[PDB]
Amino acid sequence: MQDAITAVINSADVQGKYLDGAAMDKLKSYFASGELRVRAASVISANAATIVKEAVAKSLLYSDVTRPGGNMYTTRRYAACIRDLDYYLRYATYAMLAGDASILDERVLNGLKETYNSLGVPISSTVQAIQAIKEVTASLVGADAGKEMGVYLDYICSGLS
Amino acid sequence: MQDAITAVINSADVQGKYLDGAAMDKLKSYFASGELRVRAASVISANAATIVKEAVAKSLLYSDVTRPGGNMYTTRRYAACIRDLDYYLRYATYAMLAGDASILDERVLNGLKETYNSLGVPISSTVQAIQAIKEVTASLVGADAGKEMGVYLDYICSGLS
Amino acid sequence: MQDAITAVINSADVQGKYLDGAAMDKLKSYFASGELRVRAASVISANAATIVKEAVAKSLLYSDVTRPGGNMYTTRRYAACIRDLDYYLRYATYAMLAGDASILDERVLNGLKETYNSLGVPISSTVQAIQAIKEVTASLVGADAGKEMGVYLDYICSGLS
Amino acid sequence: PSQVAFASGDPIPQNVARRTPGPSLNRFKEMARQVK
Amino acid sequence: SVVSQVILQADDQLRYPTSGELKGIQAFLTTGAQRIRIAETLAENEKKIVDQAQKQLFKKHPEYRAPGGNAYGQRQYNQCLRDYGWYLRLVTYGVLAGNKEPIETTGLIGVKEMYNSLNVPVPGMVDAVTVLKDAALGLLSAEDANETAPYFDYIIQFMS
Amino acid sequence: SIVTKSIVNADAEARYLSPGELDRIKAFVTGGAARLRIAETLTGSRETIVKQAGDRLFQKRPDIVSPGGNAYGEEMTATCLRDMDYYLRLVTYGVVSGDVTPIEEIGLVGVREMYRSLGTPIEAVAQSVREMKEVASGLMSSDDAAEASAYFDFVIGKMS
Amino acid sequence: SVKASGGSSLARPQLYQTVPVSAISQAEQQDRFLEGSELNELTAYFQSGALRLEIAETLTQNADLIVSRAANRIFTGGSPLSYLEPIPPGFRPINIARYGPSNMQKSLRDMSWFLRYTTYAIVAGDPNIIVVNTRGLKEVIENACSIDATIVAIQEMRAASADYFRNNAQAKEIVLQYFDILLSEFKAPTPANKVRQGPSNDIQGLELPQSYFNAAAKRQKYAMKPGLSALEKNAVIKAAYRQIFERDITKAYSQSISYLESQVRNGDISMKEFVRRLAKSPLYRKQFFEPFINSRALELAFRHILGRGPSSREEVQKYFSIVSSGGLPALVDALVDSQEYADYFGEETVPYLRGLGVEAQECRNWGMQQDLFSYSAPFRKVPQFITTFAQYDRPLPDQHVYGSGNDPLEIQFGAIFPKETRNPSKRPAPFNKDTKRILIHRGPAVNNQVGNPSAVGEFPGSLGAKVFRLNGGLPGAKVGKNTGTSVKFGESSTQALIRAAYRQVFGRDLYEGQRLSVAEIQLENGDISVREFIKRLAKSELFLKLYWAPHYVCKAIEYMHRRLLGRPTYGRQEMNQYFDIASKQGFYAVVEAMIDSKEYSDAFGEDTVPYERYLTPGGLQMRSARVGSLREDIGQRVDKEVTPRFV
Amino acid sequence: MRDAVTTLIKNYDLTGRYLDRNAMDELKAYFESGSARIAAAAMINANSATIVKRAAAQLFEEIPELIRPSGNAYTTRRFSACLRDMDYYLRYASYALIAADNNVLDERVLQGLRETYNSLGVPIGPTVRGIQIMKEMIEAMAEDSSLNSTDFIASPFDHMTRELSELSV
Numbered sequence A, B, C: 001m002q003d004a005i006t007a008v009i010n011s012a013d014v015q016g017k018y019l020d021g022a023a024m025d026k027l028k029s030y031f032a033s034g035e036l037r038v039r040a041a042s043v044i045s046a047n048a049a050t051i052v053k054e055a056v057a058k059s060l061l062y063s064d065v066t067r068p069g070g071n072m073y074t075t076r077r078y079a080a081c082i083r084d085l086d087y088y089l090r091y092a093t094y095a096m097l098a099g100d101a102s103i104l105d106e107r108v109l110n111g112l113k114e115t116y117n118s119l120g121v122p123i124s125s126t127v128q129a130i131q132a133i134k135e136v137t138a139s140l141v142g143a144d145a146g147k148e149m150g151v152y153l154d155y156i157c158s159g160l161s
Numbered sequence D: 001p002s003q004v005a006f007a008s009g010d011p012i013p014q015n016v017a018r019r020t021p022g023p024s025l026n027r028f029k030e031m032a033r034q035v036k
Numbered sequence E: 001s002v003v004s005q006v007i008l009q010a011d012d013q014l015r016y017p018t019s020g021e022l023k024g025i026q027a028f029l030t031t032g033a034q035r036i037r038i039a040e041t042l043a044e045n046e047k048k049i050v051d052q053a054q055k056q057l058f059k060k061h062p063e064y065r066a067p068g069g070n071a072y073g074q075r076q077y078n079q080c081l082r083d084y085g086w087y088l089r090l091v092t093y094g095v096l097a098g099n100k101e102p103i104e105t106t107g108l109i110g111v112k113e114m115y116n117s118l119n120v121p122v123p124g125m126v127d128a129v130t131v132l133k134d135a136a137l138g139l140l141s142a143e144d145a146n147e148t149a150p151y152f153d154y155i156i157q158f159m160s
Numbered sequence F: 001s002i003v004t005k006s007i008v009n010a011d012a013e014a015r016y017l018s019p020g021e022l023d024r025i026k027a028f029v030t031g032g033a034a035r036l037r038i039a040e041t042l043t044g045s046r047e048t049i050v051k052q053a054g055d056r057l058f059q060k061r062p063d064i065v066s067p068g069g070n071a072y073g074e075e076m077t078a079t080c081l082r083d084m085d086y087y088l089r090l091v092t093y094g095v096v097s098g099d100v101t102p103i104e105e106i107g108l109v110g111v112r113e114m115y116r117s118l119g120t121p122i123e124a125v126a127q128s129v130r131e132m133k134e135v136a137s138g139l140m141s142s143d144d145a146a147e148a149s150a151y152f153d154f155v156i157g158k159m160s
Numbered sequence G: 001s002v003k004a005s006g007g008s009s010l011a012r013p014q015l016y017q018t019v020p021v022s023a024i025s026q027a028e029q030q031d032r033f034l035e036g037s038e039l040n041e042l043t044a045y046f047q048s049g050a051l052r053l054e055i056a057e058t059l060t061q062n063a064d065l066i067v068s069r070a071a072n073r074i075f076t077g078g079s080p081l082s083y084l085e086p087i088p089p090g091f092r093p094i095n096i097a098r099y100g101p102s103n104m105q106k107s108l109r110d111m112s113w114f115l116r117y118t119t120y121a122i123v124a125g126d127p128n129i130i131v132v133n134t135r136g137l138k139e140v141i142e143n144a145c146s147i148d149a150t151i152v153a154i155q156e157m158r159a160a161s162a163d164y165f166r167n168n169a170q171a172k173e174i175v176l177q178y179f180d181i182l183l184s185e186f187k188a189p190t191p192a193n194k195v196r197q198g199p200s201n202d203i204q205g206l207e208l209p210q211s212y213f214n215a216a217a218k219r220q221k222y223a224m225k226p227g228l229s230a231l232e233k234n235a236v237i238k239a240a241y242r243q244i245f246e247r248d249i250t251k252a253y254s255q256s257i258s259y260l261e262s263q264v265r266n267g268d269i270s271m272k273e274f275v276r277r278l279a280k281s282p283l284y285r286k287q288f289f290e291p292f293i294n295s296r297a298l299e300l301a302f303r304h305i306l307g308r309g310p311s312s313r314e315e316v317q318k319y320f321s322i323v324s325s326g327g328l329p330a331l332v333d334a335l336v337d338s339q340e341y342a343d344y345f346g347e348e349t350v351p352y353l354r355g356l357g358v359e360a361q362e363c364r365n366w367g368m369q370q371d372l373f374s375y376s377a378p379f380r381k382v383p384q385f386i387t388t389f390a391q392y393d394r395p396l397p398d399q400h401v402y403g404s405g406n407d408p409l410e411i412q413f414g415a416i417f418p419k420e421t422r423n424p425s426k427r428p429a430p431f432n433k434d435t436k437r438i439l440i441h442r443g444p445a446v447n448n449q450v451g452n453p454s455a456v457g458e459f460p461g462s463l464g465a466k467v468f469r470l471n472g473g474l475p476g477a478k479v480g481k482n483t484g485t486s487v488k489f490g491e492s493s494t495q496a497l498i499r500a501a502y503r504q505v506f507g508r509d510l511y512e513g514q515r516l517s518v519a520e521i522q523l524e525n526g527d528i529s530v531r532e533f534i535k536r537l538a539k540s541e542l543f544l545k546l547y548w549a550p551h552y553v554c555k556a557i558e559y560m561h562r563r564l565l566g567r568p569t570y571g572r573q574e575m576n577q578y579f580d581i582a583s584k585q586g587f588y589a590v591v592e593a594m595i596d597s598k599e600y601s602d603a604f605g606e607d608t609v610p611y612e613r614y615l616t617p618g619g620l621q622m623r624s625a626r627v628g629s630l631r632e633d634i635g636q637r638v639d640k641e642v643t644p645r646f647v
Numbered sequence H: 001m002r003d004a005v006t007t008l009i010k011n012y013d014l015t016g017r018y019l020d021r022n023a024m025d026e027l028k029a030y031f032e033s034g035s036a037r038i039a040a041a042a043m044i045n046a047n048s049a050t051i052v053k054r055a056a057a058q059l060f061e062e063i064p065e066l067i068r069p070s071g072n073a074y075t076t077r078r079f080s081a082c083l084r085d086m087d088y089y090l091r092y093a094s095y096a097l098i099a100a101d102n103n104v105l106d107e108r109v110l111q112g113l114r115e116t117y118n119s120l121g122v123p124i125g126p127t128v129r130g131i132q133i134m135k136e137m138i139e140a141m142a143e144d145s146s147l148n149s150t151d152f153i154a155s156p157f158d159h160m161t162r163e164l165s166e167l168s169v
């Protein structure tokens, strides 16, 4: 994975030049937003199971999926769906703390669309479930850090499609 | 893998007949070459570290590949290509003493294209590097044994291209 | 493991003779009291979580061991003792079902006695816990099967001591 | 020194025979013997 | 025993025996009266079974008694009837316990390389069990035979 | 299924089906008619069992029905009765199969993770099935009740 | 038929071991150049090989004489050679007529084939070809052939080959010992089969005969014993690094944990404990956990520790639940503290890759494990196991008949196909001939030709793509606007049609020196119709260069069908048709066939420019499952937001 | 692995239906035939080795090229592997007989059979022929034996023929 610090180092490393003032401003922006990122991560970590709880209730519950014939009928499937949204929330916080969507394109999305197609998991529904996470996360933490969380949750939605 | 001897016997077993004439001719040409093929291998084995040294110097060194942006820039990537050209030298040695490129088929070209395209290794730069080995080995061991190595080293070159 | 049915078989196997009427009378006893063992196993299986709690509260809870300074104070060690007693009851059910205390000699008292001396687990407190298990299981199932159950729980008590 | 040339030199041609009808068509071989 | 097989399967998943597993025990414990009856009719009537089994084997296979055989000596010939007596002993143990496990551990697990290191043919002993089976079930009653039949058939399976 | 369990055990060793397994399938086949009798009484009285044991749950544990509880409201009470209807249906699958494998795979694996996410006390769902056991037992004969209870008691153990 | 395919990569079983094969593979597995030992193996063999040629040459020529003298001694009552294709234990000579012709034909050819395999054994220089093919032969031949007659037949051939050759004691002893091995292996009864017992209920049990694991090159097994000299101890540790990291990383990058190396060299922690600590180390974590998805890292962890791929769907489901609970350490702990690991490797033995030759293989995860044992496995980042296992139970997936790679991305321009080599994501599925793919219509759902074939030439009314038609009169059609009329209004409409006709054949608008000006003005004059104009743009050398030539043949056919008809192919029936034309006639005729097709004529007239009519479900998902464009009522429960009653 | 009971459960569980009259009748049909299914399984357990060997001997007389050079049953190594395969198909049909379902036949046999046989060079034509010879060997022996129902015996072997073999038409 790459964080915002490593990303601007690697961009300078590939060119084979020292970090200039324009590249240094990218770091200073991260060191300014770093306090906002750490505080946001602490809130989501505390309400990790709680954010999912509201998100499933808003989007997934009392729909087609949970009813017999759907992809969330059996208790094993339902628990796996909670597990999947527990995955998505945990990795979105990792990417938020890093300040780069490198971990998502490495451990989350790179070979997820193929699995979801094969298992018969509806992508259109799970995207809406992550959008349900996005709304809960932004309401709990704030508008400033929820927008930051929003980008990386949208990144998962884009990779799934 | 299969060597030259077993390939002759397999072809005799498929037809279901004794080693008559044409099968014997390929065997006697193999056994006569064997003594010098061992001698060539022993020289290559001993000079394995030095052969690569000259080969990288001729092809890879002082180029855009070693320069930042290239695939042989970082030290980890440098040592990987050193190991790779050590693999190419060893498996050409294996195929020389087997008298068949079946070892190159199942152990080298099983997914050499699969690894190199995924990582983003330049094919042309690798071909030039193995071509550099071919010229070094021909100068070190001999023109006769260098051509004997040449057919297997070009097999990898054609196997990449 | 060596069941009570296979106990007379293995004894006859070592002797290299057929099962006599003085050996099959014990087998006839197992076939008669077998239906009692199954019902006893069914009651314990259903109430597996409750037997433990009623034993821990009787002996272990509100004591020096559960209070600071003891070996059953920390939650980590508390969960260990709960896990232990869960395994203690389950394997005692197996010995009750099989009719022989060989599984207690093999899959319980193999190196359990020496691990407890290594960690500094009180032997007297563990014996008291198994004795507490004995009184609960006898009250739940009955006096007919509980006395039979008490033999195998005595084997653990004599094994630890 | 030029004895080393096995795969670098002239390749030895191998005799591969044409595949012939086998004892599965022994019925038809019997029929072909009577079709004269 | 089938009792052991259930508690092995339960311990493997780290759980108590299930509803269908406990009923499988219940079914065996009731039919145990028949299981006892198998033992007496084979143990006491061993001498008739063993003699019929050996005379049918050496007739069908006149090789071991023939020159360049396996059991030419009288001490060697007693050892063939010793094996016959041991196998029917193993049959009784298997039926009484209810499963193949008593026969498995004692006289099936690594039984091929046993007779390979003694020059006794395993394809020769697979025909030995069949004639022992045929002799045994013939003496047994109709409903009793069908119970004892698949225990013999498993020995045949593991041999060849 | 029992047939499922017997084959899988036989296949893992690769030895065909043992006589011990074949006897247990025979016990399952013979007891299949009794299994269909218990299942028919459970599927026949599905409306009554859920209603009686549901009412028993709301009287014994009023806290879930009380405001602040999980099953408070007309919709939430209906969902609880739907849940009880699901588990009774799972029982009928279990009774039919002989074992508790269909109950496990469909509606016992990850129930603790499910009801934690919903905010449902797992001990209260343990009560509902235990009350479903008592109502169903008081509709069929003693031998039928003891057979059916073994499936119910497995659910209790997985709940609490 | 099966609904999923794991792949059918080429399997190369070693039928028999030779001296060069035994020598080369010995250092290949150790990842070393052939040292003074393995060179001397070849040196002695190449010198003796010249003599070994003289052994066979005599035996191949006099093969007829050896089998004649054998058969005459064994078989009595006539001549056995009528229909040619020292120590007697107690054999009886078999009658020719009594044995029967069919049994005699078997008997004669085997006697020749025994000698034939002896000649191959000397030439190979290793009696492996004998040991394999003779060990479990006594039992199968016993049924309808006497053993006593066979032993004396080989013993006759032993004497026959001895007297005919008889050159030197350094030469004849090679003939003697190989025949001595032959009779001893034939005297030996069939050994017990290698039983691969299933580790749990989920995995099936297997069996392999004691002949298949006698030739297929035994995997070198290293065990850490505390007393060993440090050179072979280094060889054990290097092999342990070669297992866990797929390669010797301590040689490559000097990446080594000496802290763990010291404890195993002493014997503080076992090899089981070493593998445990090495697979939870940051060195493994960075390389085989960090770059991969949780499912794929699990699949890699299987081959590193257990030395095999996941066998069953239930196994992947179980072990994924572990890696979700506690992560990498918990996964490693579950893999090392398994009933399988301690059965195969125990405590001392280094894990080894158990493939085709090592043990019995199951017909479930064949191609999935074949690609996994390859060194190109940690580049396939798409899971192969959980994908195939789930697809096995499910029906046929939304996929092209020739694989997932044959499907282009549903974009405006550019033929973009998933590469087989770059990031292996090949998903084979057994598609048969009469398999129609379900396609989503761009326009109304009722206007699909599968259910409504009459509504094939119905235009999508603000649901799909814009239809371009030469409805308006072309400029200079009639001699009404005589000479002048500089502002002829019907001129911009036909030019916009041309641009759209260019945009359909080639997704993007072309450059200045790419536009076919001759074809444009013929359409504008009214010499050719749109149907002919589309055909000419697809018959252009530029279309050949840009879409046909750089792409796979069937990829190029598929993309052409998606451009000219605006529809993916239904299945095999259509794809095979155009592929047959591509083989015989060429590219230009494939263009011709797609335009002159009835379905083209029904959908688009002589004046109608083609358009995107049907999408693949995967293509529409890329369009309408993103953050935007996605509706609220696709796969979400919609609650009616009403103002509360207290408000 | 799924039997006829589990398949019927999964079918009704999917829709979320209680076991109706049609469900109970299908189970009752299984339980009545079950006694014949175990008795058929007892027959093939008795004659496991004899059928496999005789069916192979019939196959290599039908297609002689298998045991001839260039054939994939030529060598002892190949002959032992083929008889092992013939032993596998009979063993998994043995499981399929009691189960009365071809899920066990699909999951553990047929799923990755085509991929394997195409890899080593094992023929797929003589294979399904050898399975069909075994079928005829069981059915004739079951006709000889005192068995009331013998129709269910054809089911697993025909499914083995249908799935594995190439689609001709």
Ligand SMILES: *[C@@H](C)[C@H]1/C(=C/c2[nH]c(/C=C3N=C(/C=C4\NC(=O)C(CC)=C4C)C(C)=C\3CCC(=O)O)c(CCC(=O)O)c2C)NC(=O)[C@@H]1C
Residues within 6 Å of the ligand: B057, B060, B061, B062, B063, B066, B067, B073, B074, B075, B078
């Ligand atoms: C003083 C430093 C010593 C010295 C150096 C020396 N180095 C080379 C050759 C190379 N050195 C590197 C190393 C790096 N390049 C990278 O990208 C990185 C990572 C950031 C490093 C550390 C490489 C790859 C080369 C190859 C040059 C090329 O671009 O092709 C040489 C030349 C060797 C030769 O004979 O060709 C020399 C002389 N020389 C000494 O003796 C000093 C102790």
Ligand SMILES: *[C@@H](C)[C@H]1/C(=C/c2[nH]c(/C=C3N=C(/C=C4\NC(=O)C(CC)=C4C)C(C)=C\3CCC(=O)O)c(CCC(=O)O)c2C)NC(=O)[C@@H]1C
Residues within 6 Å of the ligand: B065, B070, B071, B072, B073, B076, B077, B078, B080, B081, B082, B084, B085, B087, B107, B108, B112, B115, B119, B121, B122, B125, B126, B129, G247, G375, G376
């Ligand atoms: C000079 C050769 C060029 C070059 C090479 C290069 N290779 C890698 C990485 C790998 N090389 C292999 C290949 C093999 N390993 C094997 O086991 C075998 C068969 C015996 C071969 C041929 C593999 C699998 C890897 C990846 C694993 C590893 O790290 O060792 C790299 C590094 C790429 C990266 O960024 O990870 C490089 C640079 N590249 C060049 O620039 C030369 C033209």
Ligand SMILES: *[C@H](C)[C@H]1/C(=C/c2[nH]c(/C=C3N=C(/C=C4\NC(=O)C(CC)=C4C)C(C)=C\3CCC(=O)O)c(CCC(=O)O)c2C)NC(=O)[C@@H]1C
Residues within 6 Å of the ligand: A060, A065, A070, A071, A072, A076, A077, A078, A080, A081, A082, A083, A084, A085, A087, A107, A108, A112, A115, A119, A121, A122, A125, A126, A129, G293, G294, G295, G296, G316, G317, G320, G386, G390
């Ligand atoms: C919940 C939002 C929706 C849903 C999820 C669902 N997932 C599974 C099972 C799996 N989940 C994954 C996916 C991942 N593997 C990874 O590596 C990552 C990234 C870290 C993830 C998230 C995989 C591979 C599995 C298979 C493992 C298993 O069998 O459990 C299921 C279960 C489906 C089944 O039983 O086959 C479900 C239901 N699907 C829905 O219905 C929700 C809308």
Ligand SMILES: *[C@H](C)[C@H]1/C(=C/c2[nH]c(/C=C3N=C(/C=C4\NC(=O)C(CC)=C4C)C(C)=C\3CCC(=O)O)c(CCC(=O)O)c2C)NC(=O)[C@@H]1C
Residues within 6 Å of the ligand: C057, C060, C061, C062, C063, C066, C073, C074, C075, C078
């Ligand atoms: C109050 C917040 C809630 C509550 C408390 C409650 N706890 C118990 C039982 C015990 N609590 C512990 C646990 C600990 N001991 C430790 O060392 C630690 C970690 C530092 C803890 C938290 C123990 C060991 C007991 C057993 C009692 C004993 O002293 O032996 C009870 C009693 C349960 C009973 O009925 O027996 C209670 C009431 N329960 C609530 O309802 C509150 C929400």
Ligand SMILES: *[C@H](C)[C@H]1/C(=C/c2[nH]c(/C=C3N=C(/C=C4\NC(=O)C(CC)=C4C)C(C)=C\3CCC(=O)O)c(CCC(=O)O)c2C)NC(=O)[C@@H]1C
Residues within 6 Å of the ligand: A057, A060, A061, A062, A063, A066, A067, A068, A072, A073, A074, A075, A078, F064, F069, F070, F071, F072, F076, F077, F079, F080, F081, F083, F084, F086, F087, F106, F107, F118, F120, F121, F124, F125, F128
């Ligand atoms: C009644 C015994 C108790 C109770 C019930 C209750 N459950 C829910 C929510 C759900 N229940 C389930 C569970 C299942 N559905 C299935 O298909 C299966 C497998 C057979 C089970 C076990 C699900 C999925 C839901 C969600 C509803 C949906 O279908 O989408 C609720 C509602 C919780 C809420 O507020 O959202 C309730 C009340 N709760 C109690 O208090 C009783 C002890």
Ligand SMILES: *[C@H](C)[C@H]1/C(=C/c2[nH]c(/C=C3N=C(/C=C4\NC(=O)C(CC)=C4C)C(C)=C\3CCC(=O)O)c(CCC(=O)O)c2C)NC(=O)[C@@H]1C
Residues within 6 Å of the ligand: G411, G412, G413, G414, G415, G416, G507, G508
């Ligand atoms: C310019 C900012 C950078 C750049 C561009 C570049 N693009 C191509 C070729 C293609 N562009 C696309 C992408 C699209 N397809 C779509 O549907 C859309 C949205 C409407 C877009 C933008 C495609 C499909 C291609 C492939 C060929 C084609 O034109 O159809 C190239 C050429 C690549 C080649 O090797 O052929 C380039 C260079 N690259 C840079 O260097 C800029 C930073």
Ligand SMILES: *[C@H](C)[C@H]1/C(=C/c2[nH]c(/C=C3N=C(/C=C4\NC(=O)C(CC)=C4C)C(C)=C\3CCC(=O)O)c(CCC(=O)O)c2C)NC(=O)[C@@H]1C
Residues within 6 Å of the ligand: G438, G439, G440, G441, G442, G444, G445, G446, G447, G448, G450
């Ligand atoms: C009705 C039971 C439920 C339902 C249906 C529904 N379907 C669509 C759209 C399509 N349906 C299909 C499927 C098929 N076409 C085929 O060729 C076959 C195989 C014979 C089938 C079954 C397709 C391809 C489409 C896409 C449009 C088209 O016709 O090409 C919709 C509309 C979806 C949309 O948003 O456009 C609907 C509503 N959905 C329900 O609510 C019912 C439970």
Ligand SMILES: *[C@H](C)[C@H]1/C(=C/c2[nH]c(/C=C3N=C(/C=C4\NC(=O)C(CC)=C4C)C(C)=C\3CCC(=O)O)c(CCC(=O)O)c2C)NC(=O)[C@@H]1C
Residues within 6 Å of the ligand: G103, G106, G107, G108, G110, G111, G113, G114, G117, G133, G134, G137, G140, G141, G143, G144, G145, G146, G149, G150, G153, H057, H060, H067, H074, H075, H076, H077, H079
């Ligand atoms: C008896 C006096 C002689 C005899 C008769 C016989 N042979 C067969 C057929 C087979 N022969 C073999 C043996 C081999 N396989 C190998 O790999 C080699 C080379 C080392 C040999 C010689 C095998 C496997 C068969 C079976 C395949 C086939 O049908 O051809 C038979 C038929 C067996 C039957 O009854 O089914 C008979 C009767 N073979 C001898 O060894 C004697 C010389």
Ligand SMILES: *[C@H](C)[C@H]1/C(=C/c2[nH]c(/C=C3N=C(/C=C4\NC(=O)C(CC)=C4C)C(C)=C\3CCC(=O)O)c(CCC(=O)O)c2C)NC(=O)[C@@H]1C
Residues within 6 Å of the ligand: G013, G206, G208, G212, G356, G359, G360, G361, G362, G363, H066, H071, H072, H073, H077, H078, H079, H081, H082, H083, H085, H086, H088, H089, H092, H108, H109, H110, H113, H116, H120, H122, H123, H126, H127, H130
């Ligand atoms: C005999 C009927 C035919 C035949 C058989 C044959 N098969 C192989 C190779 C393999 N067989 C399998 C297949 C299976 N293993 C399973 O788990 C199952 C499902 C129960 C089957 C059917 C496998 C995995 C292999 C390869 C490894 C192994 O032997 O275990 C061979 C060997 C080919 C070779 O020469 O290497 C043979 C001979 N061949 C015929 O010609 C007959 C028609």
